Design a protein around this ligand. Structure first.
Ligand SMILES: Nc1ncnc2c1ncn2[C@@H]1O[C@H](COP(=O)(O)OP(=O)(O)OP(=O)(O)O)[C@@H](O)[C@H]1O
Ligand SMILES: [Mg+2]
Lengths: 148, 198, 49, 49, 212
C-alpha cells in the first residue's frame, strides 16, 4: 500500500508573508535563515491548520520550553495581519485523491487580542490549480487582492 | 501530592476571602495592598489552582487581576446588561486627563447621569427603559433609578469605589480600562473611546 | 439527662425506626445491620461467579 | 402509626406558623455580555511572488 | 524539616483537595446541592475525608453537615463568608408532600417512579385547595385557567428542587421522576414529638430555618 503524503503548505497575509507556498519533500524539509526570519512562524501556521482548537494552541518561545505558564497571550494573534488570512494544506490520499484542508483566520476588533477560525475542505480540485491563485483575485497590473 | 508553595498559598489566612471575592467576579487592583501583593507573590500557583475549574486567572497589562470563565466553566456564569456596558464605557471615558483638574479623582452621580444623557442616542435609551417610553419625566426617573442600580453592581465588581458616606459620590479605579477600546500606534484615547460609544 | 434524651430524639433516621425511645431504637438499628450483612454476603457471592 | 398524624397535621396547619429552610446560595460569576463579533476587514492587496 | 507539606497543612486534607472530584463537588456544594447515597462517587468521597472537609469549610464560617439519613449539605453561620437564602412557601408545600410520598409504602411498588399528576393529586387531597390557590392569584376561585397556572408553578418549583438535588427526572421522560432521602429536611419541625413552638425556636437558633 502507498502511504499518503503532504504535498505543500500555503500562507496568505501572515506577518511578513503576503502569499507564499512551500513545497514539502517526501522525507525531509529544512528551513534556514537568520534570527527573526520567520521559520517558527511557518511551523505555527502548519500546526494551526492541523488543529484549529483555539483552547489548545499556545506558541511559547523555544526558551521557556516545558514551563506551564498560563501566559496572558497565546502568541498567535501577533503573527497575523489586519484583514483576512488563510492557511491551507494539500494532501495526496492513499487513494491518489487530492484534498485541500485549511482554515480562514481573522483578527477580532476589540481590546482583547482574540482570533477567529473557520475550517474548510475542498475535494476534486483539478491538479492544475494552485492554492495561491485560487485564493486571490488579480486586480490591477499584477497587484492581486485576497478574497473572503 | 501537592506543590509545597501552592499548599502554603492556600493555607494563608487571606485566601478564603479573596476566593470568595474572585468567584464573584471582583477585580483586584493596586488599591488593595495586601490582596494585590498576595496575588503577585503566588500567581504561578493560583493560576494552576483555578485552571482546575476551567476558569482563567488573568493579570491585565494595567496591573489588576481578574478571572475569566471558559465555556466549560465549573463556576456558574452570569452576564451584564446592555445598560451596564453603556455605563462602563462612560466611566472609561471619564478616566480622562482634565479629570484631574476637574474633580481631583472624586465624581458625583450627577456627572455620570448627565454625561450618559448627553452622549447616548435616544433610541438606545428607550431600549434601556422600555421601547414604548417617550421623553417623559417618569421615564427619566426610572432611568435614574436604573443608573444607581447598575452603579452599585459595578461597585460590587470593584470598578468604582463609593466615598464612605450616604451620598453618591465616588472615584474611578484603573480596572475600568476593561471596558476600554483597542489602542493602535499613535491613536488618541478620547477619539477611539468616543468612536466605540457612538 | 433530659437534655441528652432530647438531643438524641431528633437523630432518628426513617419511619420503621420511629420508636421515639432512643434505647429502643438501638436494637432496630442493629437489626438493620444484620440484614445488611446478609445482603452483602449474597452480593459478594454473586460477584465471585 | 407514628408519622401519619405527626406529618399530616403539619401540612394541614402550616399557615398558622409558616417557616422556611436555609440554603447556601453562592454568587454567580459575572461576565461581560458578548457584543456582536466585529472582525477586521481591510481588502488587503500586494504584489504576487 | 522545612519545605514540608506538614508545615502548612495536614497530609490528608491536601490529599483530598488534590483529588479530581473536588472541584465539581465544591462548586455544587456552594450552590446549595444536597448529596445523598445514590451518587456514589461524591458520597464516598465525602465519607472518606469528612473531618478534613468540615475543618476546611470552617474557615468560611460555614458548617458542613451530615443529616442522620446520610446526606451532606452546607449551613452558613450569621457571619458567613458565603451568602445564605431561604425557600418559598410553595417550595415547602411541595417539599413536605414529596416527603410523605417517600414514606408512603402504598406507592413503594412504583420503585420510586412518580408522575407530576400523582404529586399534584396528593397535594390537593391534603392541603386546602381553594385557600392555597390564593398564592397563585388573589381572585382564584377554582377556574381551570387558574388550576393550570397552579400546575405550571408546581412544575417550575419541582424543577428548582431537582437542581437542589432533592429529586431526579428520568433519563428520557420528564413527566416522571425519582425521590431521594434529602427530602427529610422538610420534616425537621416534627421529627420529635414535642411542643411545636419550642422546636421552631430551636431550629431558628441553630440557623436551620427562618420565619416569613
Ligand atoms: N506574536 C508576535 N507578535 C509580534 N511579532 C512577532 C510575533 N511572533 C513573531 N514575531 C516576529 O516575527 C519575526 C519572525 O519570528 P520567528 O520566530 O518566526 O523567526 P525565526 O526565523 O523562526 O527565528 P528564530 O530562529 O530566532 O526563532 C520576528 O521578528 C519575531 O520578532
Ligand atoms: Mg523562530
Amino acid at each position: 500500500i502507498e502511504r499518503g503524503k503532504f504535498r505543500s503548505l500555503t500562507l496568505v497575509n501572515w506577518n511578513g508573508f503576503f502569499a507564499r507556498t512551500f513545497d514539502l519533500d517526501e522525507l525531509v524539509t529544512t528551513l534556514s535563515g537568520g534570527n527573526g526570519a520567520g521559520k517558527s512562524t511557518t511551523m505555527a501556521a502548519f500546526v494551526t491548520a492541523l488543529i484549529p482548537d483555539l483552547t489548545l494552541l499556545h506558541f511559547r518561545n523555544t526558551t521557556e520550553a516545558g514551563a506551564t505558564s498560563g501566559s496572558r497571550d497565546k502568541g498567535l494573534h501577533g503573527k497575523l495581519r489586519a484583514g483576512v488570512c488563510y492557511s491551507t494544506l494539500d494532501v495526496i490520499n492513499s487513494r491518489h485523491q487530492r484534498v485541500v484542508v485549511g482554515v480562514r483566520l481573522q483578527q477580532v476588533a476589540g481590546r482583547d487580542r482574540k482570533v477567529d477560525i473557520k475550517p474548510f475542505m475542498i475535494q476534486g480540485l483539478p491538479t492544475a490549480i494552485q492554492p495561491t491563485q485560487l485564493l486571490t483575485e488579480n486586480v490591477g497590473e499584477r497587484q492581486a487582492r485576497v478574497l473572503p | 501530592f501537592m506543590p509545597v508553595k501552592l499548599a502554603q498559598a492556600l493555607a494563608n489566612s487571606l485566601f478564603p476571602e479573596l476566593d470568595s471575592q474572585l468567584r464573584a467576579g471582583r477585580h483586584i487592583g493596586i488599591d488593595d495592598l495586601d490582596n494585590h501583593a498576595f496575588l503577585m507573590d503566588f500567581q504561578e500557583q493560583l493560576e494552576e489552582f483555578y485552571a482546575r475549574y476551567n476558569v482563567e486567572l488573568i493579570r491585565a497589562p494595567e496591573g489588576f487581576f481578574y478571572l475569566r470563565p471558559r465555556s466549560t466553566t465549573l463556576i456558574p456564569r452570569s452576564v451584564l446588561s446592555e445598560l451596564d456596558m453603556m455605563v462602563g464605557k462612560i466611566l472609561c471615558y471619564l478616566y480622562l486627563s482634565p479629570e484631574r483638574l476637574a474633580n481631583q479623582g472624586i465624581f458625583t452621580s450627577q456627572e455620570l447621569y448627565e454625561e450618559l444623557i448627553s452622549l447616548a442616542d435616544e433610541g438606545k435609551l428607550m431600549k434601556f427603559v422600555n421601547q414604548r417610553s417617550s421623553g417623559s419625566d417618569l421615564d427619566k426617573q426610572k432611568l435614574q433609578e436604573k443608573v444607581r442600580t447598575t452603579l452599585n453592581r459595578l461597585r460590587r465588581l470593584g470598578m468604582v469605589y463609593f466615598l464612605p458616606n450616604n451620598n453618591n459620590k465616588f472615584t474611578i479605579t484603573e480596572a475600568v480600562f476593561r471596558f476600554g477600546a483597542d489602542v493602535r500606534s499613535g491613536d488618541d484615547p478620547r477619539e477611539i473611546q468616543l468612536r466605540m460609544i457612538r | 439527662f433530659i437534655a441528652v434524651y432530647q438531643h438524641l430524639r431528633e437523630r432518628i433516621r426513617q419511619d420503621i425506626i420511629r420508636t421515639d425511645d432512643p434505647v429502643d431504637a438501638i436494637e432496630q438499628m442493629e437489626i438493620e445491620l444484620a440484614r445488611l450483612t446478609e445482603e452483602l454476603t449474597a452480593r459478594e457471592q454473586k460477584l465471585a461467579i | 402509626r407514628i408519622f401519619s398524624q405527626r406529618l399530616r397535621q403539619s401540612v394541614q396547619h402550616y399557615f398558622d406558623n409558616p417557616w422556611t429552610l436555609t440554603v447556601a446560595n453562592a454568587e454567580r460569576l459575572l461576565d461581560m455580555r458578548d457584543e456582536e463579533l466585529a472582525l477586521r476587514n481591510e481588502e488587503v492587496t500586494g504584489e504576487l511572488p
